[PDB]
Design a protein around this ligand. Structure first.
Ligand SMILES: Cc1ncn(-c2ccc(C(=O)N[C@@H]3[C@H]4CC[C@@H]3N(c3ncc(Cl)c5c(N)noc35)C4)c(Cl)c2)n1
Ligand code: NA
Lengths: 235, 55
């Protein structure tokens, strides 16, 4: 995240980090004690993934962290990386052993399809992650967060040469300087509803972080609510 | 003047239009609809989407 601020401990207790050959290569969000939602392009190669919940400073071993191994990866059934690495860019990760829910490890709420879309229409969400803090710059150590406004569709289409389908939205600032960045993909875009946060998007991609005239591109969660609820149901 | 399209029916989370120009509010998993018929109260120790650590 470029142009964000340090989270306080437990401010985004649904955030997770994904670690592999490099650390903090992507983010994710806690659906429940056994399931994480992320971007499918983060987990396409099927290589080993470590999920860390309750993380704050990725270079300090603290006490709220809960590390778990990923036992199964469920990319959305319509994801096909051979055609388009960023369409239907959403996946579910099953953990080996359940997270212990607490003030630092808390699920994100997921509304039905209609209300997830109403909440995105509020026009302002929060993104968070350990991605780069400048374009081509260093990764964050302390979790970063940023409020991003929804950008109208026509403005976003003109901002990029790549195609933006109706299952994606754009968010960010016309002046630049504030955006998601590489390493944040897969993390949450959430909308606060009277003090309860709901998942409205998955951080997906962009071309040049925080460059004036460019925006972050996100997956609309509303289209995938039913599939999340079905795949992650524990009862 | 009581519908889900006006101030969400005064529902904290979700609203459904019901008979006789009334609404029925509701909440996400882990919350209960409160006695005031509008608010959402935690019904589990660590309900989703809530910041509980002192900020
Ligand atoms: C056909 C298609 N549709 C999207 N495409 C595409 C094309 C180019 C890129 C790309 O190389 N983006 C660069 C590369 C380093 C910094 C930019 N980048 C980003 N990754 C993740 C994120 Cl979340 C962002 C962001 N908001 N701005 O830039 C981001 C990764 C990306 Cl991630 C996606 N290509
Ligand atoms: Na840490």
């Amino acid at each position: 995240v470029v142009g964000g601020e340090d989270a306080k401990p437990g401010q985004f207790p649904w955030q997770v980090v994904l670690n592999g050959k490099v650390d903090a290569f992507c983010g994710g969000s806690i659906v429940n004690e056994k399931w994480i939602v992320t971007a499918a392009h983060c987990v396409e190669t099927g290589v080993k993934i470590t999920v860390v919940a309750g993380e704050h400073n990725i270079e300090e071993t603290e006490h709220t962290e809960q590390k778990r191994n990923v036992i199964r990866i469920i990319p959305h059934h319509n994801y096909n990386a051979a055609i388009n690495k960023y369409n239907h860019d959403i996946a579910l990760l099953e953990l080996d052993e359940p997270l212990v829910l607490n003030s630092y490890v808390t699920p994100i709420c997921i509304a039905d399809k209609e209300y997830t879309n109403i909440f995105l229409k509020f026009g302002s969400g929060y993104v968070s992650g350990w991605g780069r803090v400048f374009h081509k710059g260093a990764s964050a150590l302390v979790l970063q967060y940023l409020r991003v406004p929804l950008v109208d569709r026509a403005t976003c289409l003109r901002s990029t040469k790549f195609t933006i389908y109706n299952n994606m939205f754009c968010a960010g600032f016309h002046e630049g300087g504030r955006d998601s960045c590489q390493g944040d993909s897969g993390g949450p875009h959430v909308t606060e509803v009277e003090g309860t946060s709901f998942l409205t998007g998955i951080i997906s991609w962009g071309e040049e972080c925080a460059m004036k005239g460019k925006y972050g591109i996100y997956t609309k969660v509303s289209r995938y609510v039913n599939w999340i609820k079905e795949k992650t149901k524990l009862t | 003047d009581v519908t889900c399209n006006i101030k969400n029916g005064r529902c904290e989370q979700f609203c459904k239009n019901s008979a006789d120009n009334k609404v029925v509010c509701s909440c996400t998993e882990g919350y209960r609809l409160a006695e005031n018929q509008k608010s959402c109260e935690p019904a589990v120790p660590f309900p989703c989407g809530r910041v509980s650590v002192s900020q």
